[PDB]
Paper text:
NA is a homotetrameric, type II integral membrane protein with a short cytoplasmic N-terminal domain. Crystal structures of NA catalytic domains, either proteolytically released from virions or produced recombinantly, have consistently shown that four identical subunits interact non-covalently to form a globular “head” with four-fold symmetry. We use homology-directed protein design to uncover the structural principles underlying these distinct tetrameric conformations and stabilize multiple recombinant NAs in the “closed” state, yielding two near-atomic resolution structures of NA by cryo-EM.
Due to the higher yield of N1-MI15-sNAp-174 compared to the other designs and the simplicity of the single additional stabilizing mutation (T131Q), this design was selected for further analyses. Mirroring the results obtained with other sNAps, the stability of N1-MI15-sNAp-174 was relatively insensitive to Ca2+ and the Tm of the sNAp was 14.7 °C higher than N1-MI15-WT in the presence of EDTA. The Tagg was also higher in the presence of either Ca2+ or EDTA, and N1-MI15-sNAp-174 maintained the closed tetrameric state over a period of 15 days. We determined the structure of the N1-MI15-sNAp-174 tetramer at 3.2 Å resolution using cryo-EM. The structure, which strongly resembled the overall structure of N1-CA09-sNAp-155 (backbone RMSD of 0.77 and 0.80 Å over one and all four subunits of the tetramer, respectively), confirmed that N1-MI15-sNAp-174 adopts the closed tetrameric state in solution. The new T131Q mutation helps fill the space D cavity as intended while forming a hydrogen bond to the side chain of S442.
Author numbering:
A (entry chain A), B (entry chain B), C (entry chain C), D (entry chain D): 83 to 142, 152 to 295, 300 to 321, 334 to 338, 344 to 427, 438 to 456
Write the structure that this text describes.
């Protein structure tokens, strides 16, 4: 059954915990992979943790980096992981029928993204600008059988070319080049919402792009003080609810420490720095890191809306915690 | 197919052995988890052993405690366990369609129980009295699609608030607060019987509560000398057969050593100390520990009644043995 | 689909190799169980190797001995084995619907055989003569939904009571006590043949018993010089083809070394020591050990007859090799 | 659903990467098999890596060599491998219903190939010339329910007898002896193409044989300078596209180093040394080794043609990389 993704995003009052690997304690004696850049994606039946490896075990870009996956919450061991693809940069999602994965491998000056569908190579995209072809490093968004992704090529400290793609069963059917001067969109975190795709990216405040299934797009910055224009970096995410926005961020402004969720009822379009709700995901005394979003579709949840969820990488990579939104009572987590 | 649980409990003449992990011998060289608070629950297809971990392996409350599970009798290893939830206290059962799990995580003065259904967060209950929100640590009882649980909040040496809940597909639909002065109901072991729920709890003799699907309840103590009112502690269980009762207990009165089953034909309502049958589960020369009950429904057994079963934790935790009732000839086990 | 077992046994011209574990080399570094008394049994879908353990790993009667199993040819490791039952003596077979297992546990002077069906305890048999209740240590034979087994109780150096049982879905429905003075039937290896059960046992030459589904029985010795009456020991097997017999045996008469199959066209009823075909399974320079038979039913093979197969334990236990009959060209194995 | 294999071979413009085990880094600490002679074959649902073992783990002809398999890309560990057969030489393929495997075991002067179908022994072929019976060491080709293989018996430095077989459900139904003086066909790599079988073998330039389903055959050498007659060795492969040929080879002429694919539009029938496309699979500074082909049928890919793929063994054996053809843009791999 093909995923629809016509349903609006579910409203939430707070976030509750979903999963925690506990890999570092297990790998001190047992056999556990040293993982990097993990992300979570969900199918109609199960949620899984995808990660890039180097082939190294704990307590032991390159041609040897591969993409592997395990059931959410399981230890990423050589005896439980399922191979997906070869890549030093990768993304993945499910279209309701099978897994779609995208993996970039090859030369820095000639990288090729190999598109696989259900384990079979179906298509490839070659580096247009010949400068580190790279992708989302997160879940790709599927609406109506077709999946969408954002890919970049060029410099991480200047202006590089961006393209938005529409993929059907592993094939690229429609692509556009964005006209977005002075914008920087790396490591985009995307989710479906009422048949549209909304993405919040890393400006190396947060830029966003949104688009329809014909790849028509609009852009700007999240206006919230937590300018509607631009004001290094870390991957992150934000959810749009009308004019309100949920912004995930660290607690430190000089280091990647702590993590909190802030609800700003007018932050999408307003520039004020007022907010109503602040919940705590990670204490300021603990290291956090990169974060991103993923969703649980109605086909999986049994609900009439799309449930937003997110993950935080606790820094290679040591652990990956994740949370999902609820409309019931939840407390701050240290 | 939704579990019914209208069928009376099966009569038994004695108990026969079902399972034994043998984890300590295997973990001296291999990779085995250090487990705590195990319990057994059964679905229509399989029985599984649930346990709480700390993430530590053998021969190597907290934010890192998780609930995991393995097929009954298997070694609880990092390579075979299936993640369930995050909790320092937890319970679980199957409604005939999917798994329902309840897991309490967060602050001692602000704990939240996260209710999951088929891996998806569906609801949450927040600490009403702000004092160590805690649950059954056993199998929850499902009658007619809906599952029942007993949860407490307050002091373990005084009077705390109790609530009885009815959960449908992960949602709390009906709850009541018990009016039970001078009663103490911790770590309740519950089973379905003829559409009713019967629970025998820890008074820190044995108190019990029983209730219908509208959460109307009655209570008292097991009268058996093995008072109908009250006379520290350990989790345990007891089965009701009209006025007769099967009581599980240790052999020592000063220590948790040995284990025996005693059948008292008039013990539910009578105060005499006479019994007819005594079987031996654990020798007095061996350590025993916490115990509890679980059931095997007709949908699993092919029978016209519910088969009672129980487990004993052999003390963190080293091993978990279990037995089921039979009406055939069985001998004493040392 | 219930197994029929009406089909005669398949004729063979020689034996070809099926499986070999190679566990000793793998367990010198990895995690492998120390196994004892293995045997092979087949379901309509797969063949599996059953074994008894002590819970010990390599290169590290009792209450701790359990029955476990792995897919045929796989290493018997703690991470791949599936629990079956608790026993210091056990047998198993498949009825076409589920697994039936029989496991004897408890006191030497009060042993109970616990009958399980599809993981559920269904019945028990208690020691009639109170002397080491013990079973076949092989595959049990299923004809027409019902499975048959032979169990003994008493001395291994004198006369003990034997019983033949018919089990349906885990329940004992029909049993008989054999009147067999001066016969000794331990560790019987049984197979179905044209709706009848034929068993060749250990006399501690080879005695046999055969019976129908109403448990009517006949007995005698295999007459072959390789007397029709009696002439310590080892478990073994033999196949009946009219008046001809295939006898498995070691090559040494003073030690358990070597293994060969001998085809004697008139050996079932004749006392001569002439044979036509001798194939070699194990060289005389190698240790062999206990052996037994199992079968592959039409529901598994797609054939119109029952294919005979056998296994040899290479001596606790180090390795288990197995072979199946063919009508094509096969050579001697050293 | 029986595989058809009537569809022509898919045209390609270049090769993209599919899989890479990364076993050497994982086995330095964990439990990984020392593998030899790997090959890849695909079923309608999944692709798998088959290999021969000795039973030895990393960092620890014979009667102990077995054939085992794991999902493509997974580490070949004792805890994930699935047993197939006993052999010091073997081949395998899928007919659309089940797995067909062929395994040669026994004496150098009396070897027998045991044919298994779905785990059951169905037939055997005995050494006609009594000189190291040996097979393809690759995927066997299935067209229309029936599978084809090429087997040899005799000297590796002179003239030996060859036979072509047609196998249906594990049975040999049709075989022919080739009349091919001065030809040498060892370790043949075969693929289906438009209902015909085409094989390119090792001459210890490349000889080929092709045949129909009635086992009528034609032969010659690949004419390309990269003579139509003959001009030690290594296993390899080549794909035929009309008069054009894709030839895989190493970069060194004195050692097994590097790997490249060359497209010669007239190389099947022409003797010129001109080519149009050269892609790089392995750098000349890296060791390569044996290579071979396998295919992905329409039943697996969803396409209207057969997709060619190949593997390279990186030298016992350390790693196995594989690639599939695409018609999209792909770059050279170092
Ligand atoms: C969304 O799609 C489903 C499936 O086609 C349809 O039943 C439903 O009416 C649509 N509308 C929404 C937003 O639920
Ligand atoms: C969804 O896909 C179907 C099948 O291609 C198409 O007919 C339908 O119009 C699509 N809907 C949208 C929103 O594009
Ligand atoms: C119990 O429920 C089943 C299923 O609805 C029904 O067939 C049966 O009559 C009921 N009564 C009992 C106690 O068996
Ligand atoms: C069982 O559930 C069904 C469906 O909700 C309901 O109609 C029925 O009355 C329930 N029976 C009981 C015992 O509540
Ligand atoms: C055996 O049983 C099968 C299934 O009932 C039947 O079709 C067949 O005729 C019987 N006879 C034999 C010996 O094949
Ligand atoms: C086989 O079992 C069926 C069902 O019980 C019975 O009707 C039939 O007569 C049995 N046949 C034999 C050989 O007993
Ligand atoms: C190949 O076989 C399929 C299945 O029988 C058939 O539909 C098709 O027309 C045939 N022709 C080709 C070459 O596609
Ligand atoms: C394919 O097999 C079927 C069934 O045996 C047969 O009828 C058909 O003629 C075969 N086709 C070819 C190409 O041999």
């Amino acid at each position: 059954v093909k995923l629809a993704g016509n349903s609006s995003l579910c409203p939430v009052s707070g976030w509750a915990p979903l999963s925690k690997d506990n890999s570092v304690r297990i790998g001190s004696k047992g056999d556990v992979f040293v993982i990097r850049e993990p992300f979570i994606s969900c199918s109609p039946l199960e949620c899984r943790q995808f990660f890039l490896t180097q082939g190294a075990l704990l307590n032991d870009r390159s041609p040897y980096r591969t993409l592997m996956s395990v059931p959410i919450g399981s230890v990423p061991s050589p005896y439980n992981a399922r191979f997906e693809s070869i890549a030093w940069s990768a993304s993945a999602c499910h279209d309701g029928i099978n897994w779609l994965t995208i993996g970039i491998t090859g030369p820095d000056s000639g990288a090729v993204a190999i598109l696989k569908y259900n384990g079979i190579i179906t298509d490839t995209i070659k580096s247009w600008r010949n400068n580190i072809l790279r992708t989302q490093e997160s879940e790709c968004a599927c609406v109506n059988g077709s999946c969408f992704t954002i890919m970049t090529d060029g410099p991480s400290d200047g202006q590089a070319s961006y393209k938005i793609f529409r993929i059907e069963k592993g094939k690229i059917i429609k692509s556009v080049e964005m006209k977005a001067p002075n914008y920087h969109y790396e490591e985009c975190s995307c989710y479906p919402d009422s048949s549209e795709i909304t993405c919040v990216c890393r400006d190396n405040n947060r830029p966003w792009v949104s688009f329809n299934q014909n790849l028509e797009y609009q852009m700007g910055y999240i206006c919230s003080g937590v300018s509607c224009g631009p004001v290094n970096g870390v991957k992150g995410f934000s959810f749009k609810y009308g004019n309100g926005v949920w912004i995930g961020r660290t607690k430190s402004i000089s280091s990647r420490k702590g993590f909190e969720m802030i609800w700003d009822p007018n932050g999408w379009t307003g520039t004020d720095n007022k907010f109503s709700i602040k919940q705590d995901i990670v204490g300021i005394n603990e290291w956090s890191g990169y974060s991103g979003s993923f969703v649980m579709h109605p086909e999986l949840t049994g609900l009439d809306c799309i449930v937003p969820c997110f993950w935080v990488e606790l820094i290679t990579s040591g652990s990956s915690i994740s949370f999902c939104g609820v409309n019931s009572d939840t407390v701050g987590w240290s």
